[PDB]
Amino acid sequence: EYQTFFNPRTFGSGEADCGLRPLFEKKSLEDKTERELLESYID
Amino acid sequence: IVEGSDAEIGMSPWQVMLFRKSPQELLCGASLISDRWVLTAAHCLLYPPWDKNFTENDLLVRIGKHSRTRYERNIEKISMLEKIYIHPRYNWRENLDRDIALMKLKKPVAFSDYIHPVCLPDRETAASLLQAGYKGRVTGWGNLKETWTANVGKGQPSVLQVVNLPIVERPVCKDSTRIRITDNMFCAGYKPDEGKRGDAAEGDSGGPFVMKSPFNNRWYQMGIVSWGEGADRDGKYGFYTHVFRLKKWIQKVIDQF
Numbered sequence: 001e002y003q004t005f006f007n008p009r010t011f012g013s014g015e016a017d018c019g020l021r022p023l024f025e026k027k028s029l030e031d032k033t034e035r036e037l038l039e040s041y042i043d
Numbered sequence: 044i045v046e047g048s049d050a051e052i053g054m055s056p057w058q059v060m061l062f063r064k065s066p067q068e069l070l071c072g073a074s075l076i077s078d079r080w081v082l083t084a085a086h087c088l089l090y091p092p093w094d095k096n097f098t099e100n101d102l103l104v105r106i107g108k109h110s111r112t113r114y115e116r117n118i119e120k121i122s123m124l125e126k127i128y129i130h131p132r133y134n135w136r137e138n139l140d141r142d143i144a145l146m147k148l149k150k151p152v153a154f155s156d157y158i159h160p161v162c163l164p165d166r167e168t169a170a171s172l173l174q175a176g177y178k179g180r181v182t183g184w185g186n187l188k189e190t191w192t193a194n195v196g197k198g199q200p201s202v203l204q205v206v207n208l209p210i211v212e213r214p215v216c217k218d219s220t221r222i223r224i225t226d227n228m229f230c231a232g233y234k235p236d237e238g239k240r241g242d243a244a245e246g247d248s249g250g251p252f253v254m255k256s257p258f259n260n261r262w263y264q265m266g267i268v269s270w271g272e273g274a275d276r277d278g279k280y281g282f283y284t285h286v287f288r289l290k291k292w293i294q295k296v297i298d299q300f
């Protein structure tokens with residue numbers, strides 16, 4: 001999940017929406033090299 | 044970025060370019076953390092040894108900008124800056140300790156398929172992901188190589204460059220340089236024996252070092268490109284501002300202004 005840390009009055013909008021890219025995560029599609037990153041967590 | 048590859052469209056929507064207003068000149072990288080706040084490195088704005096001391100009115104940022112020279116109306120956005128905030132304890136005299144700054148946009152930027160904010164880490168995500176050997180991703184419009192002499196072209200890409208690099212153990216970082224490292228920095232890059240290369244370079248400062256959380260599939264900015272010795276030299280590593288370590292300052296500045 002995602003829990004917000006900042007106050008929107010001063011942070012502005014977008015914190016709950018952060019870090020999800022419309023053309024990748026929101027479409028369940030991986031970019032070409034992100035598996036290298038994920039694999040490093042296990043190897 | 045040295046030994047990187049071209050970014051795919053929409054792959055780093057939080058990428059921000061920081062430019063001198065007049066004459067137009069690309070200065071550094073930066074990242075979008077909300078619709079009105081941008082994170083960058085303090086030395087991109089203040090570094091007396093290089094006669095650098097910019098004010099809000101000296102700069103502008105471009106967001107959602109895919110080509111270095113081609114204007115894409117309706118895709119890229121330009122924003123002026125309302126205010127700049129540099130860490131009060133940023134140590135420019137010695138080792139760039141707390142090399143961090145926030146910039147408030149004059150008007151909020153609209154989110155799109157090409158412009159989106161990156162997440163800042165909470166304590167548990169930082170504890171999980173900031174481990175030696177885990178890889179992060181660094182992006183930038185900076186030099187493609189180290190020069191040797193100034194008159195040899197250092198390469199300027201036409202598409203944002205991306206490289207994935209492993210976080211390095213703290214004692215290895217410390218031993219790789221004579222500069223005094225602090226807990227407000229971490230280093231990343233391949234070891235001489237790892238058969239892979241890659242690094243940030245001059246012009247990439249302020250750019251984000253991001254990691255994907257395996258817990259909620261979101262990208263988190265764990266570092267800010269800060270400094271290094273040349274670029275992509277064997278046995279040397281790039282240094283990055285530790286964003287989670289400086290999160291209480293970001294909060295104090297924003298929820299206080």
Ligand SMILES: *C[C@@](*)(O)[C@H](CCCNC(N)=[NH2+])NC(=O)[C@@H]1CCCN1C(=O)[C@H](N)Cc1ccccc1
Binds near residue numbers: 270
């Ligand atoms: C402002 C940035 O663009 C740049 C990033 C360089 C990253 N390099 C590698 N290999 N990952 N930072 C710098 O150029 C900083 C600004 C001050 C000088 N500096 C250095 O990286 C120096 N070469 C070393 C240094 C000088 C003083 C304080 C700390 C580091």
Ligand SMILES: *[C@@H]1O[C@H](CO)[C@@H](O)[C@H](O)[C@H]1NC(C)=O
Binds near residue numbers: 091096
């Ligand atoms: C930056 O410039 C302003 C002068 O307009 C001044 O307040 C400040 O001393 C400068 N910062 C330095 C050199 O630390």
Ligand SMILES: [Zn+2]
Binds near residue numbers: 017020022154159
């Ligand atoms: Zn969104």
Ligand SMILES: [Zn+2]
Binds near residue numbers: 039043
């Ligand atoms: Zn594997």
Ligand SMILES: [Zn+2]
Binds near residue numbers: 052110115
């Ligand atoms: Zn485009």
